[PDB]
Amino acid sequence: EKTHVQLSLPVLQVRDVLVRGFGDSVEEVLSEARQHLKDGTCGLVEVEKGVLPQLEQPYVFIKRSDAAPHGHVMVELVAELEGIQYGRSGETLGVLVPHVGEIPVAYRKVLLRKN
Ligand SMILES: CNCc1ccc(-c2cccs2)cc1
């Protein structure tokens, strides 16, 4: 199990997302996010004004962890619940959500730390 894995994540528009979060506690959302990333069933929503209030907390963000092998920006997971974050990292790339067949607008290449 390598420390990092290259993934191409489907980028979803928030209004298309059918399942708006991964669960109900910080530990669950991180766990489920990781399982969906493993299974190829995880999408990414880019954060713009109006996005977060349309998604369910706790949130799972991917944040930049370094400073980009082979096109894939190195990232790690950080969860947020009620204004508190669980992890510290760099800039947010987006919020992770389950992917259940929505049509993406792009794919985002990342090198994800499995931590
Ligand atoms: C290439 N697809 C295989 C694979 C994908 C993702 C992961 C994980 C992501 C986060 C924790 S495990 C592991 C294996």
Author numbering: 10 to 76, 79 to 126
Give sentences copied directly from the paper behind this entry.
The C-terminal domain is connected via a linker region with the larger N-terminal domain, which is thought to be involved in circumventing the shutdown of expression of viral mRNA and stabilising the binding of the C-terminus to the ribosome. Therefore, nsp1 is considered as a potential target for antiviral drug discovery. Using sulphur and chlorine anomalous difference Fourier maps, we report the unambiguous identification of the binding orientation of four nsp1-targeting fragment hits.
However, our new more detailed approach employed here clearly reveals two orientations for the sulphur atom. As both sulphur difference peaks are located on the same ring, our approach is powerful enough to pinpoint individual atoms on a five-membered ring system with a distance of only 2.6 Å between them.
